[PDB]
Amino acid sequence: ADLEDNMETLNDNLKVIEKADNAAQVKDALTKMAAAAADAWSATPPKLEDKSPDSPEMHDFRHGFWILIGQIHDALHLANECKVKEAQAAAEQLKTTCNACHQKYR
Amino acid sequence: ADLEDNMETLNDNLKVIEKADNAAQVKDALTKMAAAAADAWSATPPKLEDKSPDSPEMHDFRHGFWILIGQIHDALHLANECKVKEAQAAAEQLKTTCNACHQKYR
Amino acid sequence: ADLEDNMETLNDNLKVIEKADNAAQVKDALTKMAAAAADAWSATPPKLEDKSPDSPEMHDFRHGFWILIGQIHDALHLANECKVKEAQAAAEQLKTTCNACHQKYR
Amino acid sequence: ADLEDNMETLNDNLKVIEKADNAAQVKDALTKMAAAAADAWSATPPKLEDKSPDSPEMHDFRHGFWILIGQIHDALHLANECKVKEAQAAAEQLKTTCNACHQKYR
Ligand code: HEM
Ligand code: HEM
Ligand code: HEM
Ligand code: HEM
Ligand SMILES: *C1=CC(=O)N(CCCCN2C(=O)C=C(*)C2=O)C1=O
Ligand SMILES: *C1=CC(=O)N(CCCCN2C(=O)C=C(*)C2=O)C1=O
Ligand SMILES: [Zn+2]
Ligand SMILES: [Zn+2]
Ligand SMILES: [Zn+2]
Ligand SMILES: [Zn+2]
DSSP, rough: OOHHHHHHHHHHHHHHHOOSSSSHHHHHHHHHHHEEEEHGGOOOOOGTTTTTTTTTHHHHHHHHHHHHHHHHHHHHHHHHHTTTHHHHHHHHHTTTHHHHHHHHHH | OOHHHHHHHHHHHHHHHOSSHHHHHHHHHHHHHHHHHHHTTTOGGGGGTTSSSSSHHHHHHHHHHHHHHHHHHHHHHHHHHOOOHHHHHHHHHHHHHHHHHHHHOO | OOOHHHHHHHHHHHHHHHHOOOOHHHHHHHHEEEEEEEEEEETOOGTTTTTTTTTTHHHHHHHHHHHHHHHHHHHHHHHHOHHHHHHHHHHHHHHHHHHHHHHOOO | OOOOHHHHHHHHHHHHHOSSSHHHHHHHHHHHHHHHHTTTOOOOGGGTTTTTSSSHHHHHHHHHHHHHOOOOOHHHHHHTTTHHHHHHHHHHHTHHHHHHHHHOOO
């Protein structure tokens, strides 16, 4: 999937989680988020088109995905344990990682 | 790329790290490994081909890559700090993750 | 040290980081936060003094420290890399973790 | 507690995790190991007393506890999801981290 589509998948599923009634819905969403974040790994964002892959900027760009992936991984544990409110909080909190990357690279 | 080729990227780059003389070499190899781990995320392994994308087995299989990716993330920081020896040890330590997945799923 | 004293140390050093114009000062402050956060691990806050040490509340309280500890760990690598602004932003970001625990447990 | 006593707690609990019959027994042991590893954070090992608190050795020593704490955290989630063989597997894998530290500093 292209970068924009993975980003839409991340946005859609954060909202699903916010509004979720049960653990299954939160798990399903976090699962789709993980897959989207992992597929985005390799993408070159428009603002860095003129920079190579091994470029310093691209390393720092990709670093935000390691952070996101890790927060997704741990939130899915909280959902697996039926700790719905807790998993919803972890999801709300990882917005800071979304925002930081957008602020610098969108 | 396919799962086999991602494994070859992981294997190859690990020996590069093993034998490397400087930080830049280790950084480049970890970067390639991180892309290959992320790309592997959604692969279905030959031995789980009778299991569904949402099944305990496929969740456990992907969990192994969350762990791998985490370890590669940290190892790159060590490489970035030019802590080459400490980076090669992390790369050695994460081989436990490679092998753990293999024993269960290869 | 007690929990209040660890909280003062976390806060005081977060302010040092915000004010800092160099990596050395951010590193040192992140190091002291790490120590304060690990020392707070086993504290029982007043609002949970009526709860079992194995309660879901107490497990969730300690989980907030795990999150904080890992955010400090990553920010410190950023600081070791002389990514002064990126380390400051990470420190800014982990305030969400401080805020979340406080709102539930203080 | 002092470094030696926390190391006893780490070692005793590992062996309890080995032999455990149920998830409750693994959860409880891992909880105890988390606390022991967090309490050990600050400790100056005998082999490094003559080093500065901000020497590379001490930074590296503390780093190993970050790695250990994150691994205990993840295993505890597996134990809480009743994935007892997977939590036992994760626990017995900790020894990669235990051994690496002992090799350099014990
Ligand atoms: C975190 C979970 C997260 C969300 C949510 C998110 C959403 C998001 C949207 C809705 C867009 C707009 C899509 C569009 O083009 O209309 C968007 C765009 C970009 N993002 Fe994002 N994003 C989240 C996380 C992250 C992270 C962690 C990074 C960088 C590491 C990142 C980056 C970007 C970039 C670049 C774009 C613009 C891409 C484009 O338009 O082609 N996001 N995101
Ligand atoms: C860790 C860094 C890592 C390495 C290195 C590695 C290597 C590796 C090789 C060389 C192969 C054989 C490829 C072939 O075509 O014969 C192989 C195969 C598989 N692996 Fe692997 N592998 C590493 C990590 C991991 C992890 C973390 C997992 C699971 C989460 C995993 C899984 C597998 C599977 C399944 C195979 C078989 C694939 C096939 O036959 O098509 N590996 N790996
Ligand atoms: C994150 C870096 C963080 C900061 C900063 C912080 C600050 C802070 C202050 C300044 C206080 C007031 C202490 C006082 O009485 O003088 C305070 C108090 C509490 N905190 Fe805190 N705090 C941060 C993080 C966290 C986290 C992550 C948790 C829980 C996981 C947490 C908890 C608490 C609690 C409980 C108190 C009240 C203590 C008491 O009144 O006895 N904090 N924090
Ligand atoms: C990880 C799970 C882990 C285990 C288990 C473990 C065990 C252990 C023992 C049994 C000892 C000696 C016991 C005694 O009573 O003297 C011991 C001692 C030391 N350790 Fe350890 N240890 C584990 C992990 C770690 C980690 C991650 C580190 C460093 C980051 C570490 C370090 C040390 C040191 C230093 C000692 C010697 C203590 C002394 O001589 O005073 N260990 N550990
Ligand atoms: C998902 C979350 C949840 O709480 N449940 C109920 C069954 C889980 C039962 N338990 C334990 O109490 C400990 C492990 C375990 O699996 C879900 O299905
Ligand atoms: C890569 C690793 C390394 O040590 N060096 C040498 C320059 C170090 C520059 N520094 C600091 O000393 C502290 C932060 C920082 O960026 C590399 O180029
Ligand atoms: Zn967690
Ligand atoms: Zn690290
Ligand atoms: Zn990082
Ligand atoms: Zn996990």
